[PDB]
């Protein structure tokens, strides 16, 4: 087994913090005082691309492929998910990603991000929502939209779905205005953080951040966002929190996170978002995987592969099958809790806290896990 | 100007008829008795691939790119739209496609298929639908879904959206059953032809093909499908028909179409579907485009380009800009009527007939064009 293991790093636009987390995890691994933890070094070959279109991601993949990576830690969006996952499976180069889960690809894709679908639907039931509007964007695909619209159709919900991509201050006013005329009181928001911040501001500019309005934020990082105004406005706001900041592992990470040079490690100036936590865990998963391969006595090597992604015929890495099988057997504790997978490479046996906004600030009102579903606190 | 022009042909799964149309148009061009029509020959370099995943489409593109094609006539689906359009724009190789329109790509993509969005929404208004279910699949993206759900949210429609991908006879029964319990009477169906045929059968097995049920079929080929049972059942069925079979141009095509050897030209056994008509027009558009380039005295050549799609830096074809600009200026008559485009490469100044199902069979009840919108017949 090699003393150095080559892995790919494929990051896209506005993922500075995630890359900072990637770098920290790798540093902590390579400088570990524990020979058992680090019998090999991780040598990342990284592309940080700002466009993230399909052509550029394909070129990045092929560049990493020719540099002989055994696996790729990679992010994608709607525009690149298909090429990246397709090239990975075709060539048996395992993809480890913190990006939105995707059912299509079923081999060579390990999806660190657990599904929010069940939790979100369970929540809507508990609250007995029947008429609400769904504000959203499509950067992370259409799964949540489809899940909501299907649940709505089977339950006689009157849901008004509205895409807010490319809305300006005017679009919103009009949007928030009409909304005002219909007297919409309940909302589910599913957007990128940047867009989320903006919508929330608009709602506050509108004065619908007061009681009694209710907002459910459909993401895994309730605490990643500033809700000060809503805490003061008095509106209901519910969300999910995958990362538990009151645990030793997260605490220890935070201890180091706060000491990072914010100029050299952009994104360290704020606490890690859930995507950054997922990225850190991804490195933990890869480290465990290579330790396992080593125990299995599988001397991973890509010699003497041509290194050409467009080679005809395609020449898939023969040891890729072992890598992929071993990845999915990983079961470790991470920033995002129990990290464990099914054969499709999807997270299973996981939990997330459910938070509500109270005067005192965010308060935990329960949790959701894939075995018990929604469990609220009660005396 | 070369006497032979190299073009790409990228066809995916179950596109036999479309390729048959492609071949016929090219044959009719190369064997034209008219020197003005054919001052050059069209030399297609074709890939007919059965999987149609992103890896295979990228490899096909690169193979055609290295064979020195000036443009590519290509089909895609949700899985390949991004790679194909991305590679085309990056390398200034114009894509001419009959596939579902896509707003993202704004250069080097000419979209032969006109939008159905306005027509469909106009239709729902005319009929004053407020409560209906939307049966659909996602092979052609989510535009129609989004358009419906947004229109619904702004108009207080109670729409129940249901995706039917991967439904079997059991899924449908349950589906059609529950539907029965809710007493759903009105439906919009937006699926692939194969899936459409199947749903329609299920509905007939259910007995909801009678009066008074209403079905709106959201596609451009009302006549492409067998509705015999519904003609007899007595249900309302409305749809759109882009190709006018009672015109000299279509008639002449049909004259030759029916004489095709159905073994050598699979798909000729039935009348051309609207996608096949679009494919034929695509060749007409390319022929006109090359005739225009010739008049402009633009001696198109890709010498001595490396021919490597993954070349760094990317070396876009310098004459690609002219090709792309000229494509979009094309204005000709085709099987699908007036073929004309805006600078985004989208169809404009087009019309489609609106058909209803009557005892006598399909009867035209009006039309929709992008200037007049919905115009119904009335005494
Ligand atoms: C605001 O959120 C509170 C959360 O407490 C909602 O009240 C809860 O509703 C659930 C389900 O209806 C009950 O099981 C809890 O007992 C309720 N808690 C309390 C303290 O009342 C409330 O419905 C929401 N109100 C609005 C206007 O959105
Ligand atoms: C869910 O995950 C936990 C680990 O986070 C699993 O608990 C472990 O189970 C093993 C047996 O396989 C015990 O030996 C360990 O002591 C447990 N660790 C704990 C409790 O921290 C649990 O088995 C998983 N449940 C599933 C997969 O159904
Ligand atoms: C079935 O379709 C017929 C189409 O004629 C519908 O009747 C038309 O409705 C439109 C708009 O309401 C009117 O402008 C036409 O004058 C109507 N035509 C006729 C002949 O009545 C009818 O509403 C549909 N019925 C059902 C049950 O779906
Ligand atoms: C819509 O398309 C038709 C062609 O199908 C255009 O009609 C032509 O207009 C030109 C002037 O540019 C006339 O010289 C031709 O005689 C017309 N051909 C016909 C009527 O068959 C029409 O201009 C287009 N309208 C638009 C683009 O607004
Ligand atoms: C050393 O690393 C191995 C593998 O990660 C682990 O089992 C062990 O607990 C570590 N030892 C210490 C002292 O942390
Ligand atoms: C010959 O082709 C040119 C260009 O397509 C066209 O303008 C002309 O009408 C054609 N002539 C005949 C007789 O069809």
XYZ file of C-alpha atoms in Angstrom, chain A residues 53-56 58-59 62 78-80 82-84 86-87 90-91 136 138 142 145-146 149-163 167 182 184 308-312 314, chain B residues 53-56 58-59 62 78-80 82-84 86-87 90-91 136 138 142 145-146 149-163 167 182 184 308-312 314:
92
model
C -20.414 24.769 -16.249
C -20.374 21.286 -17.757
C -17.453 21.863 -20.151
C -15.183 23.145 -17.400
C -15.446 17.732 -17.584
C -12.028 19.245 -18.293
C -10.108 14.664 -17.000
C -27.718 21.092 -11.770
C -25.410 21.996 -14.663
C -22.579 19.594 -13.850
C -24.626 14.618 -14.866
C -21.150 14.879 -16.446
C -19.249 14.473 -13.198
C -21.345 9.978 -15.470
C -17.575 10.199 -15.985
C -17.876 5.100 -16.525
C -14.259 5.088 -15.366
C -37.584 27.946 -4.125
C -33.448 24.990 -8.758
C -36.194 19.519 -8.353
C -40.322 20.565 -5.428
C -41.533 17.200 -6.727
C -46.159 18.796 -5.136
C -46.746 15.036 -4.944
C -47.473 15.080 -1.209
C -49.763 18.053 -1.856
C -51.654 16.246 -4.625
C -52.285 13.210 -2.430
C -53.452 15.248 0.556
C -55.572 18.031 -0.919
C -53.070 20.732 -0.020
C -53.357 24.022 -1.855
C -49.711 24.869 -2.457
C -48.528 27.844 -4.487
C -45.040 27.180 -5.847
C -42.925 30.155 -6.916
C -39.386 30.163 -8.319
C -35.612 38.210 -8.797
C -53.769 36.868 -1.191
C -50.497 34.103 2.387
C -7.104 9.680 -20.937
C -10.762 10.135 -19.982
C -11.801 9.973 -23.645
C -9.925 6.747 -24.357
C -11.793 4.327 -26.613
C -13.033 3.212 -21.925
C -25.878 9.213 -20.859
C -23.552 12.179 -20.410
C -20.278 10.248 -20.791
C -21.334 8.700 -24.086
C -19.464 13.763 -24.621
C -17.428 11.057 -26.355
C -15.595 14.818 -29.328
C -32.203 15.868 -19.235
C -29.054 13.772 -18.785
C -27.091 15.126 -21.746
C -25.853 20.279 -20.367
C -22.717 18.572 -21.749
C -23.761 18.791 -25.380
C -21.819 23.320 -23.040
C -19.256 21.715 -25.360
C -17.264 26.445 -25.576
C -15.914 25.371 -28.961
C -46.029 14.192 -16.270
C -39.179 14.747 -16.557
C -39.208 20.824 -15.720
C -44.158 21.762 -14.579
C -42.777 25.090 -13.356
C -47.264 25.486 -10.867
C -46.438 29.194 -11.166
C -49.571 29.994 -13.172
C -51.527 27.949 -10.623
C -50.046 29.845 -7.671
C -50.938 33.214 -9.184
C -54.497 32.209 -10.054
C -55.689 30.150 -7.095
C -55.773 26.920 -9.077
C -55.781 23.695 -7.110
C -53.451 21.542 -9.184
C -52.324 18.062 -8.189
C -49.015 17.240 -9.873
C -48.016 13.585 -10.197
C -44.882 12.118 -11.784
C -45.084 3.291 -12.905
C -61.004 12.080 -5.250
C -60.633 14.049 -10.460
C -9.216 17.751 -29.593
C -12.264 18.762 -27.545
C -10.204 18.701 -24.339
C -7.434 20.911 -25.708
C -6.093 23.447 -23.215
C -9.813 25.645 -25.682
